[PDB]
């Protein structure tokens, strides 16, 4: 029979974040989430003006990956990991964002996380920008509504692709880009470009801003790899939550095309080079005005991504007239609402790559759900297996069937993090379990889940055994 | 306040073999068409070896275009065409295919009717094969399954690209391609390419050798009139029915997606320049062993065509053929679902796709006519569907900002239907005095559509 390519990138992906703490250890500064206090179900995080004594902030201890990265990469071994995918913090490179030198001890501790990572044949495959600036570029700047920060985010690059230009081969410049497409919603636009846009006089061209400006880095990035080491490898990120017409009526139909826009301007940008048609389009009916400098789209077109990394986790359905979507009656959906479509998987890899061409990486992937400690120890989360399994069959299938190209398979919070939307641990999405509770309790161990040796056979057989 | 291009390209499409007649004159050979019996309602047309008798053959006649070009093309002036979209008659310049040189009658004939158009401002638009390919080729060397075709081709492409290339701008290699993707179906195969699938014994393989042979045909003639005079466009030309989910559930939304392959692959080799992963992968399943020559891949590549002419006339709806009737829209008389929606689907699909230049060379509402006491034809019904789709296309260029080159609605002159060969099936502005039964004295007169799209093309679109 046909299986998945020899070299097929099996790994875990994490952000710094959310997974590392010791945010104010080593001369690193304060990003965005570490004034993001932890919230829960029907309680929104809140960001302070600065770090509070009273405030709870879940990203400052997370579960110590700082700590505990050189045990935890071991476990990552256990399991056979080709590939381990996190973030740079940026705020330990430049804790301000503005020096005129890097941090030393913040590219120190990277060099050492990687070595351990490559000592076990695990490619580091790193995201330049995940939710985490420097909360000094936003105070003082303005963050990425002003030109500046351009400047800085490519120095931050600079740095960092030299470095490291012998111990990663994988980059990826700004995580889940169009997360804030959604400009209405109150932390899209904050963690992905330290931006609330409705607090701005006009929140749509304001976004619209944020984005020349990242999609003018993420293309100097690109350059900049390109000189300092063309071997490297740097794609985009894209948050792909494909939307299904609710029926065959036409209007829906049409309408879901229209939407899906809201994904396919970001790749179309970041992949093909320059803005498509239909975004300029719109910019002329509601009179946006983008300020561009001389060059920024020659820019562009130098400048694209190599490869198209993307987060798929759910689907949605959509009506014309109704709502802005509806749950999809042919499906379940998890604890927290999320769907679960496995063949959503498929088509989503068939979308991306034929309207691309170009080579695809599943870089986050997972299922978010409680997990109960046994008496003896165990977690039996059967659930997830279900689910990661149901997701691998129908990935395997858009590559020996559908002929995608591949590069590999990372699944999200492989080790236990602090969630995005509330900042707690209960929503777990890891094969290793952190004891560590959304009251605070735990002492930090870690332990192999069921899923464990479970995801182990599955890289062992490349696939095979499910 | 935004609008078409002032130079958008209306106009109307033909095919030589639909409205010319005229089948054995000039030094005309016979077509696949000319030994295609006419039909009907669950009387399907049927081939014949050769021209027989006591046997009806609609194409033979048509509407006799060959003899009323000059006053039919007036006819077109007057509703102020932009453009005219025909096809080459093969056979009226190679009659059986493999002359070492063309036939001058031929030839003349159409500097004739594109010196008309001219005089008129009417800017060619020239389909080289559509439906009408030389029955000597079939019959002789088991047409295009035989790898000679492609130079039988290319040699004919080459002659009419130098004849003309002062005269047409627009061109487009093999109509409708992807019809025969559709391997059971009785006439697809054979019209596209002159073999019926089913009578080999590797059907669905047979077929992939046919368009290979067919993709490197159009490559080396995308080469051949990019030598000749790189200021002419040569594009292709798919079939476009979108296929919609019936439902949100996952598998009629991955059915679909998979499905629309049956179009996408053709525009993907002919735009794109290469075989997509999907196609290949079909073939290793299914063992296929599709005979290439070297260079054939570096043909591909470098005669990918110009831009994507297109037909669109209805949509379906598929559940996991699989069609399912769609519940959300109407349909014609015929069955053919309305859906002007689904055109700036299409569109968008389509563009956002490949990013080429588009072209609607075919739209149309094919139903009866009624000629009143007094000489008048009301095609309301006609006029109603053609506006609901300019209206959308126009959203599709406007809003969304689709490349758009123009719109030729379908048989602009009624013409010979495909299908079963009627006349009683209309699609024109100008009517055509012949019926069914052959009765008729092949007169024009206009319908009230004419002076509709008359204006449609002075308002550019403004005033529908
Ligand atoms: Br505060
Ligand atoms: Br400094
Ligand atoms: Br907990
Ligand atoms: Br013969
Ligand atoms: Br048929
Ligand atoms: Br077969
Ligand atoms: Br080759
Ligand atoms: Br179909
Ligand atoms: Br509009
Ligand atoms: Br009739």
Redesign the interface.
């Given at each position: 029979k046909l299986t998945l390519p020899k070299d097929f990138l099996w790994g875990g992906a994490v952000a710094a974040h959310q997974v590392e703490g010791g945010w104010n250890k080593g001369g690193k500064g304060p990003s965005i989430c570490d004034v993001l206090t932890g919230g829960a179900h029907g309680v929104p995080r809140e960001i302070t003006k600065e770090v509070l004594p009273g405030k709870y902030y879940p990203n400052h201890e997370a579960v110590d990956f700082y700590g505990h990265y050189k045990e935890d990469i071991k476990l990552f071994a256990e399991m056979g990991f080709k590939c381990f995918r996190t973030s740079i913090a940026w705020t330990r490179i430049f804790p301000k964002g503005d020096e005129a030198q890097p941090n030393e001890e913040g590219l120190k501790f990277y060099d050492d996380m990687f070595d351990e990572l490559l000592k076990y044949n695990i490619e580091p495959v790193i995201t330049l920008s995940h939710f985490e600036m420097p909360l000094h570029l936003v105070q003082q700047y303005g963050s990425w509504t002003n030109r500046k920060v351009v400047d800085f985010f490519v120095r931050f690059a600079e740095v960092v692709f030299e470095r490291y230009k012998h111990k990663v081969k994988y980059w990826m410049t700004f995580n889940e880009i169009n997360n804030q497409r959604n400009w209405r919603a109150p932390l899209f636009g904050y963690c992905c470009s330290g931006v609330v846009y409705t607090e701005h006089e006009n929140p749509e061209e304001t976004m619209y801003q944020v984005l020349h400006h990242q999609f003018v880095a993420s293309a100097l990035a690109v350059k900049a790899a390109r000189r300092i080491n063309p071997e490297m490898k740097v794609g985009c990120m894209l948050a792909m939550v494909?939307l299904?017409?609710?029926?065959?009526?036409?209007?829906d139909?049409?309408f879901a095309?229209?939407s899906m826009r809201e994904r396919?301007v970001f790749t179309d940008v970041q992949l093909?080079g320059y803005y498509?048609?239909?975004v300029?389009?719109e910019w002329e009916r509601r009179g946006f005005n983008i300020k561009m400098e001389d060059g920024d789209l020659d820019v562009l077109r130098e400048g694209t991504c190599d490869y198209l990394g993307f987060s798929y986790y759910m689907?949605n359905?959509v009506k014309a007239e109704g709502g802005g979507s509806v749950p999809?009656?042919?499906?379940k959906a998890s604890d927290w609402g999320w769907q679960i479509?496995?063949?959503?998987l498929?088509?989503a890899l068939?979308?991306l790559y034929?309207?691309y061409?170009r080579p695809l990486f599943i870089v986050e992937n997972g299922f978010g759900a409680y997990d109960k400690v046994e008496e003896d120890g165990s977690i039996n989360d059967d659930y997830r297996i279900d689910y990661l399994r149901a997701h691998i069959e129908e990935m395997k299938k858009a590559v020996?069937?559908?002929?995608?190209?591949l590069m590999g398979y990372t699944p999200w919070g492989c080790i236990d993090c602090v969630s995005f939307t509330t900042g707690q641990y209960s929503k777990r999405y890891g094969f290793i379990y952190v004891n560590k509770h959304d009251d605070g309790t735990g002492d930090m161990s870690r332990s192999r889940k069921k899923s464990f040796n479970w995801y182990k056979e599955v890289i062992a057989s490349n696939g095979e055994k499910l």
């Amino acid at each position: 029979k046909l299986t998945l390519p020899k070299d097929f990138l099996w790994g875990g992906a994490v952000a710094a974040h959310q997974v590392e703490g010791g945010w104010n250890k080593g001369g690193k500064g304060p990003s965005i989430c570490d004034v993001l206090t932890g919230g829960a179900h029907g309680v929104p995080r809140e960001i302070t003006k600065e770090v509070l004594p009273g405030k709870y902030y879940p990203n400052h201890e997370a579960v110590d990956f700082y700590g505990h990265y050189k045990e935890d990469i071991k476990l990552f071994a256990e399991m056979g990991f080709k590939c381990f995918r996190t973030s740079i913090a940026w705020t330990r490179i430049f804790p301000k964002g503005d020096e005129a030198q890097p941090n030393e001890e913040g590219l120190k501790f990277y060099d050492d996380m990687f070595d351990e990572l490559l000592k076990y044949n695990i490619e580091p495959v790193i995201t330049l920008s995940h939710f985490e600036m420097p909360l000094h570029l936003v105070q003082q700047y303005g963050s990425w509504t002003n030109r500046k920060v351009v400047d800085f985010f490519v120095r931050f690059a600079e740095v960092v692709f030299e470095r490291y230009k012998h111990k990663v081969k994988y980059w990826m410049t700004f995580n889940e880009i169009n997360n804030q497409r959604n400009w209405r919603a109150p932390l899209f636009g904050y963690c992905c470009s330290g931006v609330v846009y409705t607090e701005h006089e006009n929140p749509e061209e304001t976004m619209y801003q944020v984005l020349h400006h990242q999609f003018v880095a993420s293309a100097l990035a690109v350059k900049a790899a390109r000189r300092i080491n063309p071997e490297m490898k740097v794609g985009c990120m894209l948050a792909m939550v494909p939307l299904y017409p609710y029926s065959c009526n036409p209007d829906d139909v049409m309408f879901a095309q229209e939407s899906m826009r809201e994904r396919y301007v970001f790749t179309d940008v970041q992949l093909r080079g320059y803005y498509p048609s239909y975004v300029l389009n719109e910019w002329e009916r509601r009179g946006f005005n983008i300020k561009m400098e001389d060059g920024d789209l020659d820019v562009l077109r130098e400048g694209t991504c190599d490869y198209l990394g993307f987060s798929y986790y759910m689907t949605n359905a959509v009506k014309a007239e109704g709502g802005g979507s509806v749950p999809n009656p042919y499906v379940k959906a998890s604890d927290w609402g999320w769907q679960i479509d496995p063949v959503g998987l498929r088509y989503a890899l068939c979308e991306l790559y034929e309207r691309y061409q170009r080579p695809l990486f599943i870089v986050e992937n997972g299922f978010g759900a409680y997990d109960k400690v046994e008496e003896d120890g165990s977690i039996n989360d059967d659930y997830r297996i279900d689910y990661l399994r149901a997701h691998i069959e129908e990935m395997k299938k858009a590559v020996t069937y559908d002929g995608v190209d591949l590069m590999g398979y990372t699944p999200w919070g492989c080790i236990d993090c602090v969630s995005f939307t509330t900042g707690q641990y209960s929503k777990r999405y890891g094969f290793i379990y952190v004891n560590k509770h959304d009251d605070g309790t735990g002492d930090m161990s870690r332990s192999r889940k069921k899923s464990f040796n479970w995801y182990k056979e599955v890289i062992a057989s490349n696939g095979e055994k499910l």
